[PDB]
Design an enzyme around this catalytic site. Structure first.
Site, PDB file in Angstrom:
ATOM      1  N   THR F   1      -5.744-140.624  42.706  1.00  0.00           N
ATOM      2  CA  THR F   1      -7.166-140.829  42.291  1.00  0.00           C
ATOM      3  C   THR F   1      -7.479-139.977  41.075  1.00  0.00           C
ATOM      4  OG1 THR F   1      -8.159-141.427  44.427  1.00  0.00           O
ATOM      5  CG2 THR F   1      -9.554-140.249  42.878  1.00  0.00           C
ATOM      6  N   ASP F  17     -10.554-144.444  38.736  1.00  0.00           N
ATOM      7  CA  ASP F  17      -9.504-145.457  38.748  1.00  0.00           C
ATOM      8  C   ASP F  17      -9.760-146.309  39.980  1.00  0.00           C
ATOM      9  OD1 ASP F  17      -8.549-143.211  40.544  1.00  0.00           O
ATOM     10  OD2 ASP F  17      -6.916-144.651  40.901  1.00  0.00           O
ATOM     11  N   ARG F  19      -7.062-147.263  42.332  1.00  0.00           N
ATOM     12  CA  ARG F  19      -5.910-147.277  43.237  1.00  0.00           C
ATOM     13  C   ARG F  19      -6.059-146.396  44.480  1.00  0.00           C
ATOM     14  NH1 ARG F  19       0.187-145.819  41.184  1.00  0.00           N
ATOM     15  NH2 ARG F  19      -0.062-147.885  40.223  1.00  0.00           N
ATOM     16  N   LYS F  33     -14.242-146.387  43.892  1.00  0.00           N
ATOM     17  CA  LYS F  33     -14.419-144.977  44.208  1.00  0.00           C
ATOM     18  C   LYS F  33     -15.760-144.431  43.728  1.00  0.00           C
ATOM     19  CE  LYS F  33      -9.392-144.559  43.831  1.00  0.00           C
ATOM     20  NZ  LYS F  33      -8.237-143.722  43.396  1.00  0.00           N
ATOM     21  N   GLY F  47      -9.890-137.732  47.457  1.00  0.00           N
ATOM     22  CA  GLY F  47      -9.529-137.168  48.744  1.00  0.00           C
ATOM     23  C   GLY F  47      -9.238-138.273  49.745  1.00  0.00           C
ATOM     24  N   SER F 129      -5.877-136.606  42.091  1.00  0.00           N
ATOM     25  CA  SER F 129      -4.503-136.289  41.753  1.00  0.00           C
ATOM     26  C   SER F 129      -4.325-136.396  40.244  1.00  0.00           C
ATOM     27  CB  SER F 129      -3.535-137.217  42.489  1.00  0.00           C
ATOM     28  OG  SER F 129      -3.858-138.586  42.312  1.00  0.00           O
ATOM     29  N   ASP F 166      -0.419-140.430  36.125  1.00  0.00           N
ATOM     30  CA  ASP F 166      -0.401-140.059  37.532  1.00  0.00           C
ATOM     31  C   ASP F 166       0.003-141.233  38.428  1.00  0.00           C
ATOM     32  OD1 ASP F 166      -0.818-138.949  40.094  1.00  0.00           O
ATOM     33  OD2 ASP F 166      -2.964-139.397  40.024  1.00  0.00           O
ATOM     34  N   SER F 169      -2.676-142.639  40.772  1.00  0.00           N
ATOM     35  CA  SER F 169      -3.753-143.377  40.143  1.00  0.00           C
ATOM     36  C   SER F 169      -3.241-144.631  39.439  1.00  0.00           C
ATOM     37  CB  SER F 169      -4.455-142.473  39.134  1.00  0.00           C
ATOM     38  OG  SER F 169      -4.875-141.267  39.748  1.00  0.00           O
TER      39      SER F 169
HETATM   40  C1  LIG Z   1      -7.836-140.809  45.805  1.00  0.00           C
HETATM   41  C2  LIG Z   1      -6.340-140.307  45.696  1.00  0.00           C
HETATM   42  C3  LIG Z   1      -6.252-138.802  45.859  1.00  0.00           C
HETATM   43  O1  LIG Z   1      -7.257-138.150  45.517  1.00  0.00           O
HETATM   44  N1  LIG Z   1      -5.184-138.129  46.347  1.00  0.00           N
HETATM   45  C4  LIG Z   1      -3.926-138.688  46.810  1.00  0.00           C
HETATM   46  C5  LIG Z   1      -3.838-138.593  48.346  1.00  0.00           C
HETATM   47  C6  LIG Z   1      -5.035-139.186  49.095  1.00  0.00           C
HETATM   48  O2  LIG Z   1      -5.274-138.357  50.219  1.00  0.00           O
HETATM   49  C7  LIG Z   1      -4.714-140.604  49.574  1.00  0.00           C
HETATM   50  C8  LIG Z   1      -5.920-141.451  50.036  1.00  0.00           C
HETATM   51  N2  LIG Z   1      -5.490-142.399  51.012  1.00  0.00           N
HETATM   52  C9  LIG Z   1      -6.288-142.760  52.007  1.00  0.00           C
HETATM   53  O3  LIG Z   1      -7.415-142.312  52.151  1.00  0.00           O
HETATM   54  C10 LIG Z   1      -5.714-143.772  53.047  1.00  0.00           C
HETATM   55  N3  LIG Z   1      -6.135-143.431  54.459  1.00  0.00           N
HETATM   56  C11 LIG Z   1      -5.841-142.186  54.990  1.00  0.00           C
HETATM   57  O4  LIG Z   1      -5.244-141.308  54.318  1.00  0.00           O
HETATM   58  C12 LIG Z   1      -6.190-141.836  56.383  1.00  0.00           C
HETATM   59  C13 LIG Z   1      -5.903-140.631  56.969  1.00  0.00           C
HETATM   60  C14 LIG Z   1      -6.275-140.427  58.381  1.00  0.00           C
HETATM   61  C15 LIG Z   1      -6.058-139.319  59.143  1.00  0.00           C
HETATM   62  C16 LIG Z   1      -6.491-139.368  60.598  1.00  0.00           C
HETATM   63  C17 LIG Z   1      -5.891-138.300  61.504  1.00  0.00           C
HETATM   64  C18 LIG Z   1      -6.983-137.308  62.005  1.00  0.00           C
HETATM   65  C19 LIG Z   1      -6.494-136.170  62.944  1.00  0.00           C
HETATM   66  C20 LIG Z   1      -7.769-135.321  63.294  1.00  0.00           C
HETATM   67  C21 LIG Z   1      -7.432-134.128  64.282  1.00  0.00           C
HETATM   68  C22 LIG Z   1      -8.794-133.341  64.582  1.00  0.00           C
HETATM   69  C23 LIG Z   1      -5.932-145.272  52.613  1.00  0.00           C
HETATM   70  C24 LIG Z   1      -5.402-146.275  53.655  1.00  0.00           C
HETATM   71  O5  LIG Z   1      -7.325-145.512  52.334  1.00  0.00           O
HETATM   72  C25 LIG Z   1      -6.530-142.117  48.799  1.00  0.00           C
HETATM   73  O6  LIG Z   1      -6.031-143.195  48.385  1.00  0.00           O
HETATM   74  N4  LIG Z   1      -7.518-141.436  48.106  1.00  0.00           N
HETATM   75  C26 LIG Z   1      -8.008-141.935  46.820  1.00  0.00           C
HETATM   76  C27 LIG Z   1      -9.494-142.368  46.941  1.00  0.00           C
END
Ligand SMILES: */C1=C\C(=O)NCC[C@H](O)C[C@H](NC(=O)[C@@H](NC(=O)/C=C/C=C/CCCCCCC)[C@@H](C)O)C(=O)N[C@H]1C
Ligand SMILES: */C1=C\C(=O)NCC[C@H](O)C[C@H](NC(=O)[C@@H](NC(=O)/C=C/C=C/CCCCCCC)[C@@H](C)O)C(=O)N[C@H]1C
Lengths: 233, 196, 204, 198, 212, 222, 222, 198, 196
Positions: F1, F17, F19, F33, F47, F129, F166, F169
């Site tokens: 992101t 972006d 993605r 986003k 995030g 990222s 990136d 992204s």
């Molecule tokens: C922006 C990208 C970015 O900023 N960083 C890259 C990594 C980012 O975290 C990836 C994010 N992906 C998602 O959000 C995906 N879904 C999940 O990650 C879900 C996670 C769930 C965890 C649940 C477990 C909980 C345990 C609790 C115990 C008390 C996809 C499928 O949306 C992303 O793409 N971020 C973008 C916006």
């Protein structure tokens, strides 16, 4: 298996139409303490090759002695040591690349990221990377550490693909590299204002610039920033 | 982070760098670690940004309410509320706070609240990662009841050194002068304090 | 250890010309051991379909939950819920359990009764919505389904073609996944009729 | 684990369950009945953790008997199995979950058909011709996958079982002290007290 | 992986699947789990692929060297101990292999040796090794008689693997048959489980559960 | 992101972006986003996608109810305080990294909130990222007193720095312009520099290719 | 502690025709979320009409290719320039690999060429040496994405003769070089869509009796 | 563990050893002979780690046979047991130790008496009227502590054994597939091929 | 430990505290961290006592042999042997060494060998736990080519501060003057440097 102690940060570089440029600040950090300031992390080997090292300083000093010995040695029983049989950038790289992989393979690495920049005897520009894992690669632009994240995006704007290299001049190139050095000074917490820069041009040869400084920094707007949200004064 | 507060003849002055890093990356280079909790009571924030901001925002709320009901609070009181929050939540906070305020009867006062949550009243106090590098310097250059200029210089030098050695500090040096005359914001750029 | 990989199974949804398709495998196993070859992962509430891959117990639970909810919804709203709304319901239902989620990967498919528009959407285990216009994939063999779809797929297929395409994507994807297969079912949805076919595939 | 097997033939459901109860180094009992009757036409076998096992079964028993008394009607197997899956699905996300796996076999007097249900401590429920919990499935599923037919008689089914119990005594590490068998049909639940050599 | 081998009147039957995995990912459905040590010896692959494929090829070399040296075909008991001793030299290093050395020497007749990387070497009549071993045992155990026709024994093998390929997620692909006689072994085709399953279902009426 | 914020002479602009990912797999090739907290207060979020969305709505809902109650346009500092206090309450467990901006009765504003609850303020910011790639461009071209067009360019380029450089992204560029006196303009897919090249072949299967075992109609009408 | 291994992404693909074979790979080299190079060849001509590629951890990948080529050199010195058969090459690589069974080359390797009958041939290996000859094979980061596609379009899996009531499987008619290059381009443009580590460029090597040829196509750079 | 029992009566030593060989979930063999003859009047039973077990026994065998050939004389049991204790005491402090426990039973043709030796992988050696390795001792030592007499005959001893094997099949968790018995006396080593119902 | 070496007009001076602690206990309060490796080449020891003593004893042996064969060694050489030992055995050593020597041609020279085993030649260098507290002070007070007195004072002040703040330092301040004139030992007691 060791752990770096006194370290060097980014080493950035790119290649223009007639050669290559490479730069690195003159800092020797020790954790967060910016302990040493007269560190030259740009090693020239001959006058067609410059080797920039980042990572553990003691290991860098050691790679330095290896490089000098490689030169002393090439001279032995070599009547053309300064001519047809002089050290090429490609030889120097391939040597280090070897040493680097052998050391990771023995579980006692040389904690560094290295970029060998120079001009081959036939004019060709040489730019290649190798790190403590023995990993290697090439690209019109190369940077280690922080520069890989901030410097590359910038320099790539100047030379995005191969066909862009012949269109890039030393001015354009040296410019981008100096601007990148400024950006890294803005966001890298382990960087210094002073740095060294080098150009290896197939015509002009090796131009090694020392004691440069980051100039033209925007800070004025810092006065209009008060508080962190609701404060006004 | 490098922060300090020094008392002098006319009151007190607060100083800070403007660097907030997340690892080796400088998240913000123009940060303002000089926070206002009352008209003439401010603080210097070190430690977690989220923790200190949240604590500050709470102290400000408490002092605003303190006023409405009992009038103007003392600097010692503002220090107490900080200390209360910091000690009572020591296990979930990473905040080193310096409290400085200007009183008409007490002139200038400085309170430092270290990680444990204890409170210390002093002539001046330094804190933050870069503070360790200037312990010897400050101890050798501080003097009581200096003039506004002597003090703005003591701070400008001390912090330029802290920024010099500590990679977790840098950017611009910000100051805040608290005296009967009012509140004055000061800023110094690298180009100036670097060559001192 | 990984909940989303104890039982296995996959689901995929595609959009065609004035139609949407959704398909799933029929496996339900416990690690390497195959237990049932009749565990369907597609359900529907009115004209809206929902595929659920992941930990079976949660797959069952969520089905019973959305039945319950869509029921009361129809009783109060005096109409059947639409795909778009149902998506929102699913999302908030999942994020409701943000810090101890249902280990599932929901897929929604249907045509909007009022607009006649085809609609499919996917969710991560905590409700994040992904509303594609081409295809949504889910399950232990999702990487495979992605490769299969990204290639095979093309816009506005006819109900008869979309069937071939979604069946080929499902089948070949499942065959490269030890935790998927053992039978499959495919739903073809049009504004008027819905056809459910069972596929012939390897049983190993 | 313990041996918990279940097979549904033409007009009945058969449940086989190991009689051994071992605790560490010693086999404390060879005549244990790992089962509870939930209603005149519904039987449930169980295996799992030391305390949970009985406490859960009896708890489920008490509730189904209460529904019977309150409604003066006997809940269908399907319904009873749904109540149980629910109880476990609650347990799985509770403070201290029940680690119990069960097989539910009953005769639906309204549909006039026998039904077999397999449910694990997670709340996973599936309906099957034959099923098992623990490792038992590992050697018996292929036997049944081979020799099973839906129209088999209770007698045919009881033989298919003996076949399974035999493979289990041959290849399984543990001495489970034989099994206790029970049949569930239109007439209720009865135990085959002669399988120790049938 | 499912591999079996049993002894009977007509000699020895060897059947294996051909699925190779890396987690839930199916790497190959075309793996050869029967190493042809030589015209009279056979090896089965279970556990680590490379570990078996490699060390078993190595075994073949050692056997050939023994015959040149001793001007006499190596015995099954000895070929099994060479592999056995090699593997034990590495005990602890992580090798992973469960295998069966099968052969027919005029001096021993049909013989089967189980050899795993644990150092275990066992001689026996029936052996099933692999993640699908229990499923093959089920079928095999209850339909085995020393008096099986070389044709009925061949089928029981093929079918025992079918059973395992079905239930076990790590087994599958196709079935490979071998018949061990003194004149050597005889390949008996590759049977894609894809088709063999349906065929057996129809013709045999088994796998009644599955919907066809 | 990759998300950015750039203030200009008469307002503020935010870009991002499109993605979304799980590990190295692209989950959504074009997700949004850019979140609307109120008509003229938009928030860009990095995030955990589901978290930025959820936290964005919650505060959005409350700011609307608050707006209605006080009969005043929403303030960006209001969204900033409700947001941060929420994140801080959750000790950082809500993985939301946000750049919130917009105009209100008191001028134009630009903030950033980190998952643990700390907030920053400035003329240009970036998170995600692609964070560093973007900031490199902003630190190289931002100047005081940009025009609405220069700001969009800068913002748009900073996002591109991320798409290309990136791996986290990619795809498109979303922009939202909030000018002091006008209606905020949301420019979804402002840039679409990654259109897939036409496939080399059509994979339309010949009907009858898939082997079916059984068939039947389903009942939808109650 | 020191971790001697790393991951540089990339994905390779090998398909064997009737009288030819092809081995392709993207030309992107990454480290986490950064791109090290948009063009760093991964498929090499080792001589004797043998093309090879060891994908995974680049340092180990190069060490292996280098060692193999060195093997071909000596094979010539030793057996009077005799051509190294593709199958012999395969066995030799198995020894190179297994030789480090207790400190493996973190790579999935594939080699392509022609057998001693002039037919196309592809060979793929285990990080520790297990090897099999196959008609086609994808390896690397996006293998799980490409393989299924290949089983469908190269070996007609799950495809039947229309109308025959799914009783007659589609015939194994074999693909020409033109048709195979299409599935390669489509395989990579599709992989580039959903995998963040695949992109930038597509380098393909074609082996025929007439020798080795190269084809290059770009892939999205996001 | 496996069943390794040993009892020394009046003029012989009897060794009983489980016939099962289980590997994880499957019992691979029911006819395994966990023993090796070291000399015409010395037998050694063993149990322990998968490879070590046989490799050690055969190694010890080879050495004692070599001494016999070289000296054209048969080492007394006591001596053979001292050689074995030494080999294990070396192994215990070596790089990768042998995890094997053994029972050594032989007839001393010079003293004209039977002897039983128990030695564990640590090199702990003790001479006993009866002994066992693994858990077996836990249920059999009290039986023998009760019913054992030094002048018992081989027949009496074989009965006392049957008594032990019975308690073991009753209280032990694992199905060890019965035992193989062997007698060692003045005339050598012979196996009681009829104990599966003696 | 607090140690430093400063070059000046007539050569070089080495200074150190005398405290060696094992935990919070002061094992030795009159320690001598100023070690002689040659006539006019000395070193300052910080880090493990056993590690630095062992390394020192080895360097002294090497230089004694170097002499016998090739005459007087340079200060740079003595630094090289130290650096060689320290780098080559980095994984089993905890030694921070400062090497200072007086040459007739080079006058005064100072080499610092930090934990990594790298070598650094400088006008002056500080090291040890207490060195961190006087980074800012020394940077602001050091000047090149000071006189013997100006230098003995720079060191006396710098170390008195380090000892002030760092609990791992203390006792007496010891000095060693290296010049053409010879070798001079200096000692300063708490009563003197404490009130500076
Ligand atoms: C922006 C990208 C970015 O900023 N960083 C890259 C990594 C980012 O975290 C990836 C994010 N992906 C998602 O959000 C995906 N879904 C999940 O990650 C879900 C996670 C769930 C965890 C649940 C477990 C909980 C345990 C609790 C115990 C008390 C996809 C499928 O949306 C992303 O793409 N971020 C973008 C916006
Ligand atoms: C039978 C299956 C079986 O019996 N048991 C299942 C477990 C078995 O060990 C799996 C085996 N699979 C393989 O051998 C596969 N190869 C590997 O797993 C190689 C592993 C290398 C590890 C070192 C780390 C490398 C990291 C590289 C990063 C680029 C297949 C592909 O050969 C199996 O299937 N066994 C069958 C016969």
């Amino acid at each position: 298996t060791q752990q770096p102690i006194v370290t060097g940060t980014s080493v950035i570089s790119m290649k223009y139409d007639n050669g290559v440029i490479i730069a690195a600040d003159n800092l020797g950090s020790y954790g967060s303490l910016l302990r040493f300031n007269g560190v030259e992390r740009l090693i020239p080997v001959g006058d067609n090759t410059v080797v920039g090292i980042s990572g553990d300083i003691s290991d860098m000093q050691h790679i330095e002695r290896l490089l000098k010995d490689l030169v002393t040695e090439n001279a032995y029983d070599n009547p053309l040591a300064d001519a047809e049989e002089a050290l090429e950038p490609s030889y120097i790289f391939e040597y280090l690349a070897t040493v680097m992989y052998q050391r990771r393979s023995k579980m006692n690495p040389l904690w560094n990221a290295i970029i060998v920049a120079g001009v081959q005897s036939n004019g060709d520009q040489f730019l290649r990377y190798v790190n403590l894992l023995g990993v290697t690669y090439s690209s019109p632009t190369l940077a280690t550490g922080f520069g890989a994240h901030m410097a590359n995006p910038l320099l790539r704007k100047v030379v995005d693909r191969e066909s862009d290299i012949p269109k890039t001049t030393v001015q354009v190139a040296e410019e981008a590299i100096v601007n990148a050095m400024r950006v890294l000074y803005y966001r890298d917490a382990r960087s210094s204002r002073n740095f060294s820069l080098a150009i290896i041009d197939k015509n002009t040869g090796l131009t090694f610039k020392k004691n440069l400084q980051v100039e033209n920094m925007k800070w004025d707007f810092a006065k209009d920033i008060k508080g962190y949200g609701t404060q006004k004064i | 982070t490098s922060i300090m507060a020094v008392t002098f003849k006319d009151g007190v002055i607060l100083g800070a760098d403007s660097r907030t890093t997340t690892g080796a990356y400088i998240a913000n280079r123009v940060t303002d670690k000089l926070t206002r909790v009352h008209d003439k009571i401010w603080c210097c924030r070190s430690g977690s940004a989220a923790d200190t901001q949240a604590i500050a925002d709470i102290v400000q709320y408490h002092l605003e309410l303190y006023t409405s009901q009992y009038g103007t609070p003392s600097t010692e009181t503002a220090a107490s509320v900080f200390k209360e929050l910091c000690y009572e939540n020591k296990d979930n906070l990473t905040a080193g706070i310096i409290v400085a305020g200007y009183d008409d009867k007490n002139k200038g006062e400085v309170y430092t609240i270290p990680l444990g949550g204890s409170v210390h009243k002093l002539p001046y106090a330094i804190a933050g990662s870069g503070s360790t590098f200037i312990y010897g310097y400050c101890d050798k250059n501080f003097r009581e009841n200096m003039s506004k200029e002597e003090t703005v210089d003591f701070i400008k030098h001390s912090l330029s050194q802290a920024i010099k050695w500590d990679g977790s500090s840098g950017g611009v040096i910000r100051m805040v002068v608290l005296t009967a005359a009012g509140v004055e914001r000061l800023i110094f750029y690298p180009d100036e304090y670097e060559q001192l | 250890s990984d909940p989303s990989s104890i039982n296995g199974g996959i689901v995929v949804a595609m959009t065609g010309k004035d139609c949407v398709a959704i398909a799933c495998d029929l496996r339900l196993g416990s690690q390497s051991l195959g237990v049932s070859n009749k565990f369907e992962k597609i359900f529907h509430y009115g004209h809206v379909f929902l595929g659920i891959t992941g930990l079976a117990t949660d797959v069952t639970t969520l089905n019973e939950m959305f039945r319950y909810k869509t029921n009361l919804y129809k009783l109060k709203e005096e109409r059947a819920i639409e795909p778009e709304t149902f998506t929102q319901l699913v999302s908030s239902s999942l994020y409701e359990r943000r810090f101890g989620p249902y280990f599932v990967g929901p897929v929604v498919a249907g045509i909007n009764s009022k607009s006649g528009k085809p609609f499919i959407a996917g969710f991560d285990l905590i409700g994040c919505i992904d509303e594609a216009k081409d295809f949504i994939v889910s399950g232990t063999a999702s990487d495979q389904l992605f490769g299969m779809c990204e290639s095979l797929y093309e816009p506005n297929l006819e109900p008869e073609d979309l069937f071939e395409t979604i069946s080929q994507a499902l089948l070949n994807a499942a065959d490269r996944d030890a935790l998927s297969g053992w039978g499959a079912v495919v739903y073809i949805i049009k504004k008027d009729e819905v056809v459910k076919r069972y596929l012939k595939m390897r049983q190993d | 684990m313990d041996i918990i097997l279940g097979i549904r033939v033409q007009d009945s459901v058969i449940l086989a369950s190991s009689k051994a109860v071992t605790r560490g180094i010693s086999v404390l009992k060879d005549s244990d009945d790992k089962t509870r009757q939930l209603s005149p036409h519904t039987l449930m076998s169980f295996a799992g953790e030391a305390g949970d096992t009985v406490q859960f079964a009896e708890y489920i028993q008490a509730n189904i008997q209460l529904y019977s008394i309150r409604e003066d009607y006997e809940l269908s197997p399907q319904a009873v199995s749904s109540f149980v899956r629910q109880e476990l699905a609650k347990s799985i996300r509770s403070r201290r979950p029940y680690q119990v796996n069960v097989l539910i076999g009953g005769y639906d007097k309204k549909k006039n058909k026998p039904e077999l249900y397999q449910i694990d401590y997670l709340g996973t429920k599936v309906e099957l011709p034959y099923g098992a919990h623990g490792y038992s499935g590992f050697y018996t599923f292929s036997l049944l996958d081979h020799h099973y037919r839906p129209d088999m008689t209770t007698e045919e089914g009881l033989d298919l079982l003996k076949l399974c119990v035999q493979e289990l005594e041959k290849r399984m590490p543990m001495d489970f002290k034989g099994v206790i068998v029970k049949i569930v049909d239109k007439d209720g639940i009865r135990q085959v007290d002669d399988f120790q050599a049938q | 992986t499912t591999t079996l081998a049993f002894r009977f009147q007509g000699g020895i039957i060897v059947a294996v699947d051909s699925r190779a995995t890396a987690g839930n990912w199916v790497a190959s459905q075309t793996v050869k789990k029967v190493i042809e040590i030589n015209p009279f010896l056979l090896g089965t692959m279970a556990g680590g692929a490379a570990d078996c494929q490699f060390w078993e090829t190595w075994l073949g070399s050692q056997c050939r060297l023994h015959e040149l040296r001793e001007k006499e075909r190596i015995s099954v008991a000895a070929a099994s101990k060479i592999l056995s001793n090699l593997v034990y030299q590495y005990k602890g290093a992580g090798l992973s292999m469960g295998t069966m050395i099968c052969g027919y020497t005029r001096k021993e007749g049909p013989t089967i040796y189980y050899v795993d990387s644990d150092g275990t070497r066992l001689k026996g009549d029936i052996f099933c090794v692999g993640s699908g071993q229990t499923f093959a045992y089920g079928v095999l155990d209850s339909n085995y008689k020393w008096d099986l026709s070389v044709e009925d024994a061949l089928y029981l093998g093929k079918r025992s693997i079918l059973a395992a390929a079905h239930r076990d997620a790590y087994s599958g692909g196709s079935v490979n048959l071998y018949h061990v006689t003194e004149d050597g072994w005889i390949y008996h085709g590759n049977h894609d489980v894809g088709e063999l399953f349906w065929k057996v279902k129809e013709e045999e009426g088994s796998f009644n559960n599955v919907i066809g | 992101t990759t998300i950015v914020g750039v203030k200009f002479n008469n307002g503020v602009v935010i870009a991002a972006d499109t993605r979304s990912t799980q590990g190295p797999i692209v989950a959504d090739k074009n997700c949004a986003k850019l979140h609307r907290i109120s008509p003229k207060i938009w928030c860009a979020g990095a995030g955990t996608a589901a978290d930025t969305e959820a936290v964005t709505q919650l505060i959005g809902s409350n700011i609307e109810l608050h707006s209605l109650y006080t009969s005043r346009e929403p303030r960006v500092v209001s969204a900033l305080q409700m947001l941060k206090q929420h994140l801080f309450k959750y000790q950082g467990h809500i993985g939301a990294y946000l750049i919130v901006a917009g105009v209100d009765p008191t001028g134009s504003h630009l903030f950033s909130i980190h998952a643990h609850g700390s907030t920053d303020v400035g003329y240009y910011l970036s998170l995600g990222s692609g964070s560093l790639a973007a900031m490199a461009v902003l630190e190289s071209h931002w100047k005081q007193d940009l025009t609405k067009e220069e700001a969009i360019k800068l913002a748009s380029d900073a996002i591109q720095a991320g798409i290309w450089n990136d791996l986290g992204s990619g795809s498109n560029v979303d922009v939202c312009v909030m000018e002091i006196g006008k209606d905020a303009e949301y420019l979804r897919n402002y840039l679409t520099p990654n259109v897939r090249e036409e496939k080399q072949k059509s994979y339309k299967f010949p009907r009858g290719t898939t082997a079916v075992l059984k068939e039947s109609i389903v009942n939808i009408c109650d | 502690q020191f971790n001697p291994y790393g991951d540089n992404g990339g994905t390779i693909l090998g398909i064997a025709g009737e009288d030819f074979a092809v081995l392709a790979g993207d030309t992107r080299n990454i480290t986490d979320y950064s791109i090290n190079s948009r063009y760093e060849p991964k498929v090499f001509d080792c001589g004797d009409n043998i093309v090879m590629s060891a994908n995974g951890f680049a340092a180990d990948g190069d060490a292996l290719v280098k060692r193999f080529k060195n093997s071909v050199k000596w094979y010539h010195f030793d057996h009077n320039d005799k051509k190294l058969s593709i199958n012999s090459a395969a066995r030799n690589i198995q020894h190179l690999l297994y030789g480090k069974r207790f400190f493996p080359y973190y790579v999935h390797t594939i080699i392509a060429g022609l057998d001693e009958d002039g037919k196309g041939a592809v060979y793929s290996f285990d990080p520790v040496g297990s090897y099999e000859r196959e008609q086609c094979r994808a390896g690397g980061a996006a293998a799980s994405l490409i393989m299924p596609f290949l089983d469908n379009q190269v070996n007609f899996k799950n495809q039947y003769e229309p109308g025959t009531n799914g009783k007659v499987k589609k015939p194994l008619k074999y693909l020409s070089v033109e048709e195979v290059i299409k599935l390669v381009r489509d395989s990579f443009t599709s992989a580039t869509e959903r995998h963040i580590q695949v992109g930038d460029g597509l380098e393909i090597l074609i082996v025929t009796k007439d020798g080795v040829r190269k084809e290059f196509y770009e892939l999205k750079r996001d």
